[PDB]
Amino acid sequence: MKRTFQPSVLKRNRSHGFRARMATKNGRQVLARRRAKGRARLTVSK
Amino acid sequence: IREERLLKVLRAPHVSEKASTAMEKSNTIVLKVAKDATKAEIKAAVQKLFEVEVEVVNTLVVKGKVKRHGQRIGRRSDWKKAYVTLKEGQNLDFV
Amino acid sequence: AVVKCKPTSPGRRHVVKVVNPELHKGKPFAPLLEKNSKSGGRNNNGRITTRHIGGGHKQAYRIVDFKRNKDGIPAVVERLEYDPNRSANIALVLYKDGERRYILAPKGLKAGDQIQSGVDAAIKPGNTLPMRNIPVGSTVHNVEMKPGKGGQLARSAGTYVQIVARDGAYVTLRLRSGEMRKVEADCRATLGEVGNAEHMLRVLGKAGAARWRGVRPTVRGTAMNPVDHPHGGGEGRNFGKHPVTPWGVQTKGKKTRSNKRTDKFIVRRRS
RNA sequence: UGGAGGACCGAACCGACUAAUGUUGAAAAAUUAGCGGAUGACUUGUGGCUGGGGGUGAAAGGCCAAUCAAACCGGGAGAU
RNA sequence: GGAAGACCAAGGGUUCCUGUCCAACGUUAAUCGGGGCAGGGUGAGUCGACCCCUAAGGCGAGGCCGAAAGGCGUAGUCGAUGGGAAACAGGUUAAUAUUCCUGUACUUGGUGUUACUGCGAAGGGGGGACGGAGAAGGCUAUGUUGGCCGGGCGACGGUUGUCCCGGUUUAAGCGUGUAGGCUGGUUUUCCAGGCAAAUCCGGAAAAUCAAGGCUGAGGCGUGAUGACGAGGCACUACGGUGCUGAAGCAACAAAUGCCCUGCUUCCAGGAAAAGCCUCUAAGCAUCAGGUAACAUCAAAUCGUACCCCAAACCGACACAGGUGGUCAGGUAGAGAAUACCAAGGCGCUUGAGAGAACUCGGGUGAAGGAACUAGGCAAAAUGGUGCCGUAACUUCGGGAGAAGGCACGCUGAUAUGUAGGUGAGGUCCCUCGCGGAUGGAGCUGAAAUCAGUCGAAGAUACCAGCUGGCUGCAACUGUUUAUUAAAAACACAGCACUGUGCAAACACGAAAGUGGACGUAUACGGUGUGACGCCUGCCCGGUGCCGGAAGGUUAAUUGA
Ligand SMILES: [Mg+2]
Ligand SMILES: [Mg+2]
Ligand SMILES: [Mg+2]
Ligand SMILES: [Mg+2]
Ligand SMILES: [Mg+2]
Ligand SMILES: [Mg+2]
Ligand SMILES: [Mg+2]
Ligand SMILES: [Mg+2]
Ligand SMILES: [Mg+2]
Ligand SMILES: [Mg+2]
Ligand SMILES: [Mg+2]
Ligand SMILES: [Mg+2]
Ligand SMILES: [Mg+2]
Ligand SMILES: [Mg+2]
Ligand SMILES: [Mg+2]
Ligand SMILES: [Mg+2]
Ligand SMILES: [Mg+2]
Ligand SMILES: [Mg+2]
Ligand SMILES: [Mg+2]
Ligand SMILES: [Mg+2]
Ligand SMILES: [Mg+2]
Ligand SMILES: [Mg+2]
Ligand SMILES: [Mg+2]
Ligand SMILES: [Mg+2]
Ligand SMILES: [Mg+2]
Ligand SMILES: [Mg+2]
Ligand SMILES: [Mg+2]
Ligand SMILES: [Mg+2]
Ligand SMILES: [Mg+2]
Ligand SMILES: [Mg+2]
Ligand SMILES: [Mg+2]
Ligand SMILES: [Mg+2]
Ligand SMILES: [Mg+2]
Ligand SMILES: [Mg+2]
Ligand SMILES: [Mg+2]
Ligand SMILES: [Mg+2]
Ligand SMILES: [Mg+2]
Ligand SMILES: [Mg+2]
Ligand SMILES: [Mg+2]
Ligand SMILES: [Mg+2]
Ligand SMILES: [Mg+2]
Ligand SMILES: [Mg+2]
Ligand SMILES: [Mg+2]
Ligand SMILES: [Mg+2]
Ligand SMILES: [Mg+2]
Ligand SMILES: [Mg+2]
Ligand SMILES: [Mg+2]
Ligand SMILES: [Mg+2]
Ligand SMILES: [Mg+2]
Ligand SMILES: [Mg+2]
Ligand SMILES: [Mg+2]
Ligand SMILES: [Mg+2]
Ligand SMILES: [Mg+2]
Ligand SMILES: [Mg+2]
Ligand SMILES: [Mg+2]
Ligand SMILES: [Mg+2]
Ligand SMILES: [Mg+2]
Ligand SMILES: [Mg+2]
Ligand SMILES: [Mg+2]
Ligand SMILES: [Mg+2]
Ligand SMILES: [Mg+2]
Ligand SMILES: [Mg+2]
Ligand SMILES: [Mg+2]
Ligand SMILES: [Mg+2]
Ligand SMILES: [Mg+2]
Ligand SMILES: [Mg+2]
Ligand SMILES: [Mg+2]
Ligand SMILES: [Mg+2]
Ligand SMILES: [Mg+2]
Ligand SMILES: [Mg+2]
Ligand SMILES: [Mg+2]
Ligand SMILES: [Mg+2]
Ligand SMILES: [Mg+2]
Ligand SMILES: [Mg+2]
Ligand SMILES: [Mg+2]
Ligand SMILES: [Mg+2]
Ligand SMILES: [Mg+2]
Ligand SMILES: [Mg+2]
Ligand SMILES: [Mg+2]
Ligand SMILES: [Mg+2]
Ligand SMILES: [Mg+2]
Ligand SMILES: [Mg+2]
Ligand SMILES: [Mg+2]
Ligand SMILES: [Mg+2]
Ligand SMILES: [Mg+2]
Ligand SMILES: [Mg+2]
Ligand SMILES: [Mg+2]
Ligand SMILES: [Mg+2]
Ligand SMILES: [Mg+2]
Ligand SMILES: [Mg+2]
Ligand SMILES: [Mg+2]
Ligand SMILES: [Mg+2]
Ligand SMILES: [Mg+2]
Ligand SMILES: [Mg+2]
Ligand SMILES: [Mg+2]
Ligand SMILES: [Mg+2]
Ligand SMILES: [Mg+2]
């Protein structure tokens, strides 16, 4: 039936995109944790 | 425009059946150009370097394919293609 | 014209609608209009601070003049309009000099009526003036509580205030709620009453109607679970407690008025 | 003459009343045959808002990512 | 086949097209593929994004607030799902085309000339600019028949005829100004209301004229001696290439598309802002700048393949599920239901036999007809259109499609096709036209009645109510336990209590602030009851709430 993931790009990027993280203290802490674990990509970007 | 930029625009002739077709029938040549060059600069650069008259330059961007080498997934680089219209006037040849 | 409907469908049965034939059919006066957005009864935290609001038809804010401060310049009533923003009707009036303003439409008002505001104005309904110049005992609406602020009291349809006392700087009013309140005599008021007093007669007849008016359903507390309300579940139909608001404060008789500022003004409570 | 309605019959559309099949399914809630609304308290697209001692609830403790009488992830933590 | 077709948006990201290969992948083989490897493929001033403008909402200099982080918000600045300039037909690729080519156009800017000239904004005013329902008149897409043109006399009786098949296509633009809708016009004087200014808007006063302006589908003309065009003639690697090219009209029906953001009506009273038009302030005056015609240049960048009712998106799979917008052929039909077909796409990626029990999905049944069973569960039956007929009870609307019954095919006549619908030719009129009247050829075309005829059966299929009687509860339409409960639960219109005087109670926030509301006691919140009709009796001892301050009692504080 209608499942849980109905994808949208504009949605995806406003919610989790780079800039969206950088907006806030918490977000920059996420990006800190990721850079510390050494991910391939931090956020969802194209 | 500066000439120094110009000589950096045009990478290579594009060779294929479509290419040959337009070159023969419509009097048009096909170029791989630097990803960032524009219709202005390509008009300039052909008119300058091959010294022949350009009518108009149409362009497109080719997304490189995705390949596998030994299980590894690589991505062929993008690039820009330019259809370059010459007026019926000039005749450009292969010696 | 208050009229019942022939019941051609169960919904239509109890409907009483109030048809004022004198109202303007066709668009309002545009330069006097504003944009208005419905809030869903939600504050700047997006929470619902006031339940039971939302949906409703779209409305445009008519800019109504409550200060009536354009003075000593006659104005005549062009037409009566329906205001979705309030109970009462309104009037589109034309001051001699070429300005138009909306006002609250008082009783006895109809197209063609000369009115005016200022200290000097004649006493007839739809005229405004500071209240020390008003005959004691007279009936008025659109009353200010502070000089120059604009009207606040008795803006609803059919409402009005009776002026029962003049003493020094303070006139005493009998408010529509039945409560005697002092207001400084320098506050302008407007003669007569608010019209469309039959507003209160009209019956909706069907839930849908209330839902057009921007009113969403109301869940009886004692229907909910004990977690959601103090009134709480029970087995079948069970009450057991004294009635309270959802936040636990006692309702049905508890006085919640507390101000010590405004006290010196209030003579006596309504009863 | 006129064209009111949470009006009527009825497809798309919305829904889920019964029956059977399915129950290591074609499907982690469906199918087939019938059933209710279908100009409205309707339905649906795109975007936004409300965040867990909270939301939201035409109120079933329902709903918040197939997890809800207090979500999820990391920590206290090798809780006991 | 209102899709299992065609086109998009989303989402995917090369799956597109060619060659080549068959291990793995594909529920079997696979020489095939959406699999592997290599190559090719996406061409824009006018289609989108960008860009200009704002909605909700977000961020937010100063600012207010807050232990810190931070919260709120002003000027701003972002944010489309909305408003903002302009391109069409044909031809072409193995794969793009409104982009390439042929033709024919269009818009906005820059410079230039020339003629004329009061131009200037973040300010002013208009415009942009807005609901539901309804009605029906004008049309067009489109279709059917006829004329026309090309071909056909046909595997079997009959077919040179009232016979058969196929075609009968043509756009934006530009000129024209029609069915319709809206609105009096023009000139002069005054007024300061439009935050300052105004010659513009609004207001007042005369003067004068009756047609004036605005809007507008479609038609007609051009576009077009052009294109497309059944086919035929040449060559062909048999895949195609080249040449040539008939007719290309008329009547009728007709949208849910357009006129129409219109018109009529209702109440629940129906976005904002910029481009756009005009008024002027600071200003600048032979400069500048504006208006028109011709010339001239520019129009950047990004998306463009393919899939989108799905084997490519969301479901772990090539998954019987889920996904918004657009187009809408024929005969029958009220119809976008249904049945059969067209354009077009498919045969659902294991078959081959056999023809047991049993299970699934169906079809049929003697005699009986609920005797079954928790229960007529399921099945059967009803089923359409017109006409006739219809009860208790009723809130006078209903109940009611109550119930029940009758005709229903074909052929002929009334009429070689009627009533209607459309309306040619002609004649007359004209303020001469896309005009008016007359006019009735052609074309279309119900319904009925009478006479005949076939069958067991004519609403022959698909399609398409089971009905009636008594009673519980709930007034009613709605809403609900996504995934065992749709109800008698919830809501409900209404009723009552009570709170609240506006800096409202209340609610969210340590606070600022916000909602309540740009509302104001005919308002707003809370609780209960739940249409309508009849009514709502007793009790203040208990808990609660409201009023009272006399006494008795009592906290910090002060310290005899
Ligand atoms: Mg070009
Ligand atoms: Mg491009
Ligand atoms: Mg690379
Ligand atoms: Mg806000
Ligand atoms: Mg309320
Ligand atoms: Mg309101
Ligand atoms: Mg209520
Ligand atoms: Mg309950
Ligand atoms: Mg809760
Ligand atoms: Mg409690
Ligand atoms: Mg209960
Ligand atoms: Mg009980
Ligand atoms: Mg849905
Ligand atoms: Mg549901
Ligand atoms: Mg079904
Ligand atoms: Mg149905
Ligand atoms: Mg019904
Ligand atoms: Mg129905
Ligand atoms: Mg909506
Ligand atoms: Mg709900
Ligand atoms: Mg869940
Ligand atoms: Mg919790
Ligand atoms: Mg808890
Ligand atoms: Mg510990
Ligand atoms: Mg342990
Ligand atoms: Mg221990
Ligand atoms: Mg069908
Ligand atoms: Mg979507
Ligand atoms: Mg894409
Ligand atoms: Mg691949
Ligand atoms: Mg392929
Ligand atoms: Mg291949
Ligand atoms: Mg295999
Ligand atoms: Mg095999
Ligand atoms: Mg093999
Ligand atoms: Mg492949
Ligand atoms: Mg465009
Ligand atoms: Mg804003
Ligand atoms: Mg700051
Ligand atoms: Mg902020
Ligand atoms: Mg912006
Ligand atoms: Mg954007
Ligand atoms: Mg858009
Ligand atoms: Mg746009
Ligand atoms: Mg293609
Ligand atoms: Mg403006
Ligand atoms: Mg609009
Ligand atoms: Mg209207
Ligand atoms: Mg036609
Ligand atoms: Mg012949
Ligand atoms: Mg006209
Ligand atoms: Mg040909
Ligand atoms: Mg439609
Ligand atoms: Mg439509
Ligand atoms: Mg393309
Ligand atoms: Mg395409
Ligand atoms: Mg779909
Ligand atoms: Mg499809
Ligand atoms: Mg899939
Ligand atoms: Mg398959
Ligand atoms: Mg599928
Ligand atoms: Mg759907
Ligand atoms: Mg059809
Ligand atoms: Mg028909
Ligand atoms: Mg078929
Ligand atoms: Mg076929
Ligand atoms: Mg297909
Ligand atoms: Mg069987
Ligand atoms: Mg049977
Ligand atoms: Mg039998
Ligand atoms: Mg029998
Ligand atoms: Mg019997
Ligand atoms: Mg037995
Ligand atoms: Mg029995
Ligand atoms: Mg049954
Ligand atoms: Mg049956
Ligand atoms: Mg009955
Ligand atoms: Mg005949
Ligand atoms: Mg005939
Ligand atoms: Mg006739
Ligand atoms: Mg006639
Ligand atoms: Mg017989
Ligand atoms: Mg018979
Ligand atoms: Mg009983
Ligand atoms: Mg009910
Ligand atoms: Mg009752
Ligand atoms: Mg119901
Ligand atoms: Mg359930
Ligand atoms: Mg159920
Ligand atoms: Mg507080
Ligand atoms: Mg406060
Ligand atoms: Mg507000
Ligand atoms: Mg109240
Ligand atoms: Mg109840
Ligand atoms: Mg007591
Ligand atoms: Mg007592
Ligand atoms: Mg007390």
User: How far, rounded to the nearest angstrom, does the alpha carbon of residue C116 sit from its chain's CA centroid?
Assistant: 23
CA of C232 to C1' of E542 (A): 23
Contact yes or no for C101/C71 (Cβ under 8 A): no
What is the C-alpha to C-alpha distance for residues A38 and A28, in angstroms, rounded to an integer? 15
Which of C179, C188, C176, C167 minimizes the C-alpha distance to C262? C179
Tokens of C57: 């038809």
Phi-psi region of A22 (alpha: psi -120 to 50; beta: other; left: phi over 0): alpha
User: Environment class of residue C116 by beta-carbon count within 10 Å: exposed (0-12), middle (13-18) or buried (19+)?
Assistant: buried
User: How far, rounded to the nearest angstrom, does the alpha carbon of residue A46 sit from its chain's CA centroid?
Assistant: 11
CA atoms within 13 A on the CB side of C139: 10
Q: Please tell me the distance between residue A2's alpha carbon and the centre of ligand 62 in angstroms.
A: 11
Tokens of C122: 């004649």
CA of A14 to C1' of D48 (A): 12
For residue C126, give the amino acid letter. G
What is the C-alpha to C-alpha distance for residues C130 and B33, in angstroms, rounded to an integer? 82
For residue C158, give the amino acid letter. G
Torsion sign (Cα): B27, B32, B34, B35: positive
Nucleotide nearest to C10 (CA to C1'): E476
CB atoms near residue C199 (< 10 Å): 18
User: How far, rounded to the nearest angstrom, does the alpha carbon of residue C104 sit from its chain's CA centroid?
Assistant: 10
For residue C56, give the amino acid letter. G
CA distances from B66 to A31, A44, B69, B72, C93 (A): 29, 20, 10, 11, 74
CB atoms near residue C75 (< 10 Å): 22
User: How does DSSP classify residue C25?
Assistant: P
Interface chains of chain B (3 or more CB pairs under 8 Å): none
Contact yes or no for C131/C100 (Cβ under 8 A): no
Find the length of chain C: 271
Q: Please tell me the distance between residue C75's alpha carbon and the centre of ligand 73 in angstroms.
A: 95
What is the C-alpha to C-alpha distance for residues C262 and C256, in angstroms, rounded to an integer? 14
User: Environment class of residue C268 by beta-carbon count within 10 Å: exposed (0-12), middle (13-18) or buried (19+)?
Assistant: exposed
What is the C-alpha to C-alpha distance for residues C5 and C8, in angstroms, rounded to an integer? 8
Q: In a 3-state reduction of DSSP, which class is residue B46?
A: helix
Q: What is the resolution of this structure in A?
A: 4.3
Interface chains of chain A (3 or more CB pairs under 8 Å): none
Tokens of C134: 């008003």
For residue C103, give the amino acid letter. I
User: How far, rounded to the nearest angstrom, does the alpha carbon of residue C30 sit from its chain's CA centroid?
Assistant: 23
What is the C-alpha to C-alpha distance for residues C147 and C187, in angstroms, rounded to an integer? 5
Contact yes or no for C175/C163 (Cβ under 8 A): no
β-bridge partners, C129? C189
**H helix or E strand, kind and range, residue B23:** helix B17-25
Nucleotide nearest to C55 (CA to C1'): D41
Tokens of C226: 């004990």
Domains delineated in chain C: 1-113 (2.40.50.140), 117-194 (no CATH), 195-271 (4.10.950.10)
CA distances from B31 to B48, C79, C191 (A): 15, 73, 86
For residue B57, give the amino acid letter. V
Tokens of C160: 């009005």
User: How does DSSP classify residue B1?
Assistant: -
β-bridge partners, A36? none
CA of C146 to C1' of E65 (A): 29
- C1' of nucleotide D29: residue with nearest CA: A1
Which of C179, C65, C74 minimizes the C-alpha distance to C118? C74
Which of B93, B65, B94, B95 minimizes the C-alpha distance to B79? B65
β-bridge partners, C128? C117, C190
CA of B27 to C1' of E90 (A): 22
What is the C-alpha radius of gyration for chain B, rounded to an integer number of angstroms? 15
Contact yes or no for C105/C156 (Cβ under 8 A): no
Which of C118, C200, C220 minimizes the C-alpha distance to C159? C200
Which of C3, C155, C188, C159 minimizes the C-alpha distance to C85? C155
Q: In a 3-state reduction of DSSP, which class is residue C169?
A: coil
**Obtained via which technique?**
cryo-EM
H/E/C letters for each residue in A1-46?
CCCCCCCCHHHHHHHHCHHHHHCCHHHHHHHHHHHHHCCCCCCCCC
CA of C7 to C1' of D10 (A): 25
Nucleotide nearest to C206 (CA to C1'): E493
Q: Please tell me the distance between residue C203's alpha carbon and the centre of ligand 86 in angstroms.
A: 21
Phi, psi angle pair for B83, to nearest 5°: -85, 120
Contact yes or no for C88/C155 (Cβ under 8 A): yes
Contact yes or no for C134/C104 (Cβ under 8 A): no
What is the C-alpha to C-alpha distance for residues C100 and C88, in angstroms, rounded to an integer? 19
CA distances from C141 to C41, C119, C128, C179 (A): 29, 17, 9, 15
What is the C-alpha to C-alpha distance for residues B70 and B73, in angstroms, rounded to an integer? 8
β-bridge partners, C118? none
Q: Please tell me the distance between residue C137's alpha carbon and the centre of ligand 23 in angstroms.
A: 61
Which of C101, C129, C122, C125 minimizes the C-alpha distance to C113? C125
Residues near strand D (C-beta below 7 A) are A 1, 3-6, 8, 10-11, 14; C 8-12, 42, 45-48, 51, 55, 206-209, 211-212, 216-217, 219, 223-229, 233
Phi-psi region of B13 (alpha: psi -120 to 50; beta: other; left: phi over 0): beta
CB atoms near residue C85 (< 10 Å): 15
Phi-psi region of C212 (alpha: psi -120 to 50; beta: other; left: phi over 0): alpha
| B53 contact partners, CB below 8 Å, separation of at least 6 | B47, B86, B87, B89, B90
**H helix or E strand, kind and range, residue B17:** helix B17-25
DSSP per residue, C152-180 = -BS-STT--EEEEEEETTEEEEE-TTS-E
**H helix or E strand, kind and range, residue C18:** strand C16-18
What is the C-alpha to C-alpha distance for residues C8 and B93, in angstroms, rounded to an integer? 89
What is the C-alpha to C-alpha distance for residues C245 and C229, in angstroms, rounded to an integer? 8
**H helix or E strand, kind and range, residue B44:** helix B39-49
CA distances from C23 to C29, C75, C79, C117, C196 (A): 14, 19, 8, 24, 11
Domains delineated in chain A: 1-46 (1.10.287.3980)
**H helix or E strand, kind and range, residue B31:** strand B28-33
Q: In a 3-state reduction of DSSP, which class is residue C28?
A: coil
CA atoms within 13 A on the CB side of C72: 2
What is the C-alpha to C-alpha distance for residues C74 and C126, in angstroms, rounded to an integer? 12
Which of C131, C24, C118 minimizes the C-alpha distance to C73? C118
